Amino acid sequence: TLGDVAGDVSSIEGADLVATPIAAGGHLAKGATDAAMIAMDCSSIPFDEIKQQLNQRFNEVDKKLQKGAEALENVTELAEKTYSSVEKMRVEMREGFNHVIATIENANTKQIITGINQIIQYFNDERENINNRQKEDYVAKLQEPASGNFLLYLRKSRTSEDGSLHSLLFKIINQELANNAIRALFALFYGTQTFISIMFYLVKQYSYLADYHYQNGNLAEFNSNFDHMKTVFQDFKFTLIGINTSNSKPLVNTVLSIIEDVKNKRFIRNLRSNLYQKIIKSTKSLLDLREKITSSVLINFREKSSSVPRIETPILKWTPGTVVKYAIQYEQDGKYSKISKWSNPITVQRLANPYITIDKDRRNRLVFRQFGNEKPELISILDSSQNEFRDIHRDLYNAAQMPYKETALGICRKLIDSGAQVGASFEMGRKSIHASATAGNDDVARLLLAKNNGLLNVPDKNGYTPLHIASERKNNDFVKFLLEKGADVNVRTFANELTPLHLAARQDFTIIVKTLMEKRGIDVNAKERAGFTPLHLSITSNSRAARTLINETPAGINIKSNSGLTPLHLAVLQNNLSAAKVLVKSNKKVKLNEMDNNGMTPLHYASMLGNLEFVKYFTSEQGIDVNAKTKVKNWTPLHLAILFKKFDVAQSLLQVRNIDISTRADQAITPLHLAAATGNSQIVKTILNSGAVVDQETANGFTALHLAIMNPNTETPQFLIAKGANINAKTNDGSTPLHFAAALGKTNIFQLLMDKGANIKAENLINQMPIHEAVVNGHLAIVKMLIEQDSSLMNAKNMRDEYPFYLAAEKRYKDVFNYLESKGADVNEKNNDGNTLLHLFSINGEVEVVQFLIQNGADFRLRNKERKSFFDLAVEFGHAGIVGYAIEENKVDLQEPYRGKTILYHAICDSVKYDRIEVVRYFVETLNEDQCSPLQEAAAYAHLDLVKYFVQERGINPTAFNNDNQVSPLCIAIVGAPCGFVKSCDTPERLDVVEYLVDK
């Protein structure tokens, strides 16, 4: 919500301090209140993230060039639009791409996938790394040598070139037509999204640096950077719209074709694919826009010079002995084209009389002229013709800008006598009069008053009137002597409309605001773009400005601003005590409880910022409106003080005046819970000494006891014990704090709970025995005491088919496991209800806990209740790796006859029963086939995946031998004589392999 930031920085008053109230509104607009949030182990994260976003907003706003530097700001805004849209896509894609790490190592060559992941994260980190520097540091580090176009060099052609992985990856999705395919498809999808992000960001940053160094830096490398981003944009245009036959197909269109083939598959998958379908629209929009972009003008022009001998003037602003190098640029319909050349840079010892022999054109020409250094660099903005008049106009403008008024009057007289026509625009704006206003020169304007229409109301690029410009120049008497002409007094500027009264407030000019107020009866409480009065914009000046403006004239002392900010609010924020004092001493109709847009009063800001003197002054002086509920969910300043870990202010606010403790803040939150969350013994003891409730359960069913337990502090537990708190408590789930106490891992607090009658027998709606938590979190001592207390109740059953030793197992903590096994716990063969525990983990795809318990001495050769082998179970769900580690452990290589079955008879049956491709690939990794032809076994049930895989990993035809029409699986599948697997041939797999065999 950086738009709110812009609206609230329209008043330059307190940018960061007036950015804090949007964090306060986020506190007010987001449904934060719940026990996890109250623990504040979270709150710091969202608030720090909001502060970091605000820091990004500020350290990008301060880099921005104001207006009218080079017309390619249209290109820049096109950038920000399309770019930022790419991040609306990319932020949502990020949470999904976090999931792909779960299924790592399913392809042999996933190192390229992790390489692209680390590359994209590397530049995502660098974006914020560079994005927090200073202006000069920003430009220097974007000009940093030995890296330069580091991103361009990295993204040009690398060993991890996406074209190589592109074909094989589309083969992986072709497998998905029949998973790792989803994982790597989304890897490349995020890849192309971040590639378009790279392109937009790169062209944006080239544009920004071109503008930055084009503001009087140098036009030469400005044109160089112009060519640079033109080349980059057309390079991407070629890479994704290629008009070369001997070139790779565009990535975006091939991805699209994959999307149609996937939807043609008509199969189910994870919701990640659904997010992909949601992002399809964004991808196609980005495509269409990228081909519709092609921006700036594409051409340059040529011109010449000519010395006009009409008049001769001795001039010093036109410095003698300097070069007359000039150049022109194109500017039409809000676009620009840069050029840089002066074939005849001359150093004539004459006036500004040399005109330009510019060839006529249909495009408006901006003509600059150069001494050989950094100049205004804006002299003519013409359409058809001009004969050296622009140079005279530039001399007039810069002379007006000169502060030497005593000589400015003489030089302006001598130039206007020569015919220095006025009204021309400079720096793409009507300036000259405003340049004089900046310099504060008097006689120059008083003799230009011949053009009464101009000086009266001439606007600027942003509509800055000469009154607006002179209002921030300390030039009081000159404003006096130029005001008699009767200029408009409610006139404003174009963008971020402001009156000169509005703008004078920040610059602390009491004399100037006086000068304004004792002339006519001018409006004083006039608003502006964000709905602010000049009173609001004065307090940061922290001097006599506002103190004067309060009482010297009637004004908008209490006016509801559009942002909801009043002088009281600002005086609170920017920590201006004297302004608050003088505002209180006015004793006019200054309402104190005037709500803002958010819904919380200046006292609330004072508490949140944690300013002691403001709080006590507010509690003492006014004696009115010192504690009340807020607009939506009824906060108090004390609540804010507790939340933001400000203590001294908290007990000060308690001791200044009676503040009700029975308050009903959101979810009936009394500040006892908040104080417990902070964990300050003196604060909580003082609150209880104030007659506070001891065991008030909140609307979520939480009391301060649980939350205090989750706090690291250990004293307020005993404090709550002493102050009569129900030890046997019921949370939102009806849970008991023993669960949380064990979860955190405080042995001594747990012992105290046990001493005061806590009951281990307690549970929740899903009957969580505290042993479950005590083992999943993991610690020795809690287990020791609970055993010594009540024999673990033989580790009773949970909701799922779980025996607490199971959780202790997949936790894999050495000491507790050894303790449980030594003193008697669940063991592998006690799983008689179904198969054994080893036979049970492999069903749920266990990888490491099985191996670690085997090396923990657990037996291996047990036979399950279902006669079906542990190796076979490992094979059945893609876990033959455990069989391999059994081989290296030398458990047994199952080639010995089990009911006549050997290693080959164990590779056949399960790979027919289940489609574990990786297990077959591991079997062939342990290189052997034993003349097996699993293609024909698959075709016995006509499974196309396995027959295609055998074809691709062997190359032999699916029918190598011949017989009396019975050896071929095609005839077996089609004729289906003895009703064996015939009545269920309706499955398309029965005709799938038919074609892959007919084709050969």
Residue numbers in the entry: 48 to 225, 233 to 348, 361 to 1066
Provide the authors' original text about this structure.
Latrotoxins (LaTXs) are presynaptic pore-forming neurotoxins found in the venom of Latrodectus spiders. LaTXs bind to specific receptors on the surface of neuronal cells, inducing the release of neurotransmitters either by directly stimulating exocytosis or by forming Ca2+-conductive tetrameric pores in the membrane. The structures reveal that LaTXs are organized in four domains.
The cryoEM sample showed a homogeneous set of characteristic G-shaped flat particles, corresponding to soluble monomers of the 130 kDa mature α-LCT complex (prepore state; before membrane insertion). The G-shaped particle is composed of a C-like curved region, corresponding to the long C-terminal domain of ankyrin-like repeats (ARs), that is engulfing a central compact head region. The N-terminal head is orientated perpendicular and in close vicinity to the tail of the AR region in the best-resolved class (compact conformation), but shows a continuous movement and is tilted away the tail of the AR-domain in less well-resolved classes, resulting in less compact conformations. The resulting atomic model reveals that the N-terminal head region is composed of three domains: a four-helix domain at the N-terminal end, termed here as connector domain (residues 48–115); a central helical bundle domain (residues 116–352), and a short β-sheet domain, linking the helical bundle domain with the AR domain, termed here as plug domain (residues 353–452). The surrounding helices shield the hydrophobic surface of H8 within the cylindrical bundle and protect it from the aqueous environment. The long and curved C-shaped C-terminal AR domain consists of 22 ankyrin-like repeats, accounting for two thirds of the sequence of α-LCT.
